[PDB]
Amino acid sequence: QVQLVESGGGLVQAGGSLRLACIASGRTFHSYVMAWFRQAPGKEREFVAAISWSSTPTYYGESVKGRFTISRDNAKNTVYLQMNRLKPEDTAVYFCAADRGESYYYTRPTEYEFWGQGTQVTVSS
Amino acid sequence: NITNLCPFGEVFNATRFASVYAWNRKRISNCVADYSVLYNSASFSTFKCYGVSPTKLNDLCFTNVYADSFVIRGDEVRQIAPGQTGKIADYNYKLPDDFTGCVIAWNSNNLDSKVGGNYNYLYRLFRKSNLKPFERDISTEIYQAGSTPCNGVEGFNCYFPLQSYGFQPTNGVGYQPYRVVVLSFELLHAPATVCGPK
Ligand SMILES: *[C@@H]1O[C@H](CO)[C@@H](O)[C@H](O)[C@H]1NC(C)=O
């Protein structure tokens, strides 16, 4: 069992910025691929970003490419999501996820064993 | 120069698949590993790599590759991963904690389930201790579950250690058969025998 807790969510104005963070339990954080998904009301969990063990393949959903940066600090068991130039369509619950494996199908929720409970991000217009 | 493609067809589309307890190994060597056939598949239920990115498989060289394949239930596929426990991880097929390789599975309900139930696929239900990584046990010794010795006769606390899956086409997805291929990548102090095209 790995536990995951998101922080840094909340209310922000369109064009604004937020840094989500997610901290993991355990002493083998370096062995985990870390990911962000989000879920808007009425929608399924949508892949946002993922980062491999070395940091070195990063992955992004089409609609956040260019605006969002995923990064990890192994010393702090933490993955970060820098969200710039936020739009109302970015409003959702943001979930931290983790898996030992890096998936060819990296956008599939079923490829990640561990999930945080999520944190609300709200972008007003 | 190794120039012939690695025969992935003979692994993924083998006419027969092993019971998990008697998992099959094919050695892959002295061949070009072109993974683009696997990249263009949509029907795999899982495709994860450990210690290498799936995006780099066509660029990497290994001293040795092994393809281990077998059938298990859908909801046991999560056990074919480093750091897992359960009947399958503990007693049938164990990956090491630092595994280097990929695990691919797909639903095989259309091939491996029958109207009467398919009882051909077996798994080890009992064992005195957990498998070491890549260990294989095909023994059928009566398992002593209790105080009394069994004298190789079945009965009270004296169980035959293998059990049948009994796959029916009407089973829930978690109880349907899944075929699994585990590609083990070795990087030893030896010549590389397997490279990608690039
Ligand atoms: C196995 O057969 C399927 C069709 O049944 C085909 O799509 C696939 O390319 C084959 N797999 C390999 C690794 O050759």
Side-chain angles (χ1 to χ4, degrees):
Chain A
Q1 180 64 5
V2 175
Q3 290 189 60
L4 302 170
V5 171
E6 306 91 340
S7 60
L11 180 54
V12 70
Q13 265 221 64
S17 289
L18 267 190
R19 200 185 69 158
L20 299 193
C22 167
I23 189 174
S25 67
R27 274 164 347 254
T28 55
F29 181 78
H30 69 278
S31 72
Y32 286 85
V33 174
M34 301 303 295
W36 290 97
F37 286 75
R38 72 194 176 173
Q39 180 171 31
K43 276 174 158 227
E44 309 303 322
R45 271 164 209 210
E46 172 200 340
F47 173 82
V48 175
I51 187 166
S52 201
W53 312 285
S54 67
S55 299
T56 273
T58 59
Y59 305 93
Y60 295 103
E62 192 46 35
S63 62
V64 303
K65 217 214 141 187
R67 298 188 300 116
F68 290 12
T69 302
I70 195 173
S71 63
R72 61 187 303 149
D73 182 351
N74 284 1
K76 301 196 174 186
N77 271 39
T78 300
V79 61
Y80 298 101
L81 191 68
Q82 189 53 49
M83 307 165 79
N84 297 324
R85 292 189 319 291
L86 284 164
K87 320 171 168 185
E89 308 86 44
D90 293 316
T91 293
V93 175
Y94 283 73
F95 297 89
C96 185
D99 204 79
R100 284 295 315 268
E102 185 180 340
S103 180
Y104 181 67
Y105 309 114
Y106 55 83
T107 74
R108 290 189 191 169
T110 55
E111 289 293 72
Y112 302 84
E113 184 174 355
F114 299 114
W115 290 81
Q117 305 298 134
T119 196
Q120 187 65 49
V121 176
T122 302
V123 190
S124 57
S125 101
Chain B
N1 280 39
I2 62 167
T3 33
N4 51 308
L5 296 179
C6 294
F8 283 139
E10 296 183 12
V11 180
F12 284 83
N13 288 327
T15 49
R16 234 185 281 273
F17 266 66
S19 288
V20 65
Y21 85 94
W23 49 269
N24 179 269
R25 264 240 144 126
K26 306 180 181 74
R27 190 162 140 107
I28 293 169
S29 47
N30 301 126
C31 61
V32 181
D34 199 346
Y35 288 89
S36 41
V37 68
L38 302 182
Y39 290 153
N40 295 319
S41 299
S43 274
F44 295 144
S45 55
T46 195
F47 179 167
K48 297 178 178 177
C49 304
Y50 304 85
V52 293
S53 176
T55 66
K56 303 281 298 137
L57 292 180
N58 272 348
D59 302 300
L60 294 180
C61 292
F62 301 108
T63 49
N64 195 66
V65 179
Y66 291 128
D68 303 333
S69 56
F70 48 80
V71 169
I72 54 172
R73 284 160 57 188
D75 53 26
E76 290 170 340
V77 169
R78 70 138 191 103
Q79 289 181 49
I80 316 304
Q84 291 298 332
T85 57
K87 297 307 174 201
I88 307 307
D90 296 346
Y91 295 162
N92 291 267
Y93 188 87
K94 180 53 160 162
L95 284 183
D97 310 342
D98 68 344
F99 179 56
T100 303
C102 309
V103 178
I104 301 167
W106 64 98
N107 187 293
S108 59
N109 200 31
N110 183 270
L111 291 185
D112 287 325
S113 86
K114 265 150 215 153
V115 292
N118 180 13
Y119 294 99
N120 288 339
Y121 294 108
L122 303 184
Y123 64 88
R124 187 173 302 281
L125 176 58
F126 306 110
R127 192 173 195 273
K128 296 186 187 177
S129 79
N130 294 353
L131 290 185
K132 283 145 214 206
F134 295 123
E135 196 183 355
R136 189 163 181 274
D137 185 348
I138 62 171
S139 67
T140 53
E141 295 298 310
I142 298 310
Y143 173 86
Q144 176 169 342
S147 176
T148 50
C150 288
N151 301 29
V153 163
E154 298 197 33
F156 159 52
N157 285 105
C158 281
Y159 310 126
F160 189 76
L162 298 192
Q163 181 66 47
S164 178
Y165 274 110
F167 289 121
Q168 294 186 283
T170 53
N171 289 358
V173 175
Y175 295 84
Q176 283 171 28
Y178 278 68
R179 291 178 178 194
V180 185
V181 172
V182 183
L183 299 176
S184 274
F185 304 149
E186 271 172 31
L187 282 168
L188 305 185
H189 305 298
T193 72
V194 175
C195 291
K198 317 207 306 189

